[PDB]
Amino acid sequence: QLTTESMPFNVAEGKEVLLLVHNLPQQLFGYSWYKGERVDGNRQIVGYAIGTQQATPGPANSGRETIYPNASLLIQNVTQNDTGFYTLQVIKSDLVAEEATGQFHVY
């Protein structure tokens, strides 16, 4: 199963967290990250197109995140308010979506 996991789960204020992503399918066309536990357009952080390697910031983009070619999401300068769930959507070459949710806590 597609999974995402924070490294570290417990994150000091002002430091960084990497959302690692595991069990990707091959032949992917894009990624989309969201704040919260589901796919919710109003809370899209970033979208990525594999074909062109272009990142497009969404309405939940903070300016403090980077999505990598392997789907992982690095968040820097973390704030208390960053504590939450983060949902990844992967779009395969047949346009079928897979999703995973992960989370971290800022202290």
Residue numbers in the entry: 1 to 107
Original authors' sentences:
Human CEACAM1 (hCEACAM1) is a single pass type I transmembrane protein expressed as 12 alternatively spliced isoforms that all contain an N-terminal V set fold of the immunoglobulin superfamily (IgV) ectodomain followed by up to three type 2 constant immunoglobulin (IgC2) ectodomains (A1, B, A2), a transmembrane sequence, and a signaling cytoplasmic domain. CEACAM1 function is triggered by intercellular or trans binding of the IgV domain, resulting in higher order surface CEACAM1 oligomerization and subsequent intracellular signal transduction. In contrast to other immunoreceptors such as the T cell inhibitory and mucin domain-containing protein 3 (TIM-3), programmed cell death protein 1 (PD-1), and programmed death-ligand 1 (PD-L1), CEACAM1 serves as its own primary ligand, owing to high affinity homophilic interactions of its unique IgV domain, as well as an important microbial receptor. The displaced CC′ loop forms a cleft with the FG loop that exposes the key residues F29, S32, Y34, V39, G41, Q44, Q89, I91, N97, and E99 critical in mediating homophilic CEACAM1 interactions.
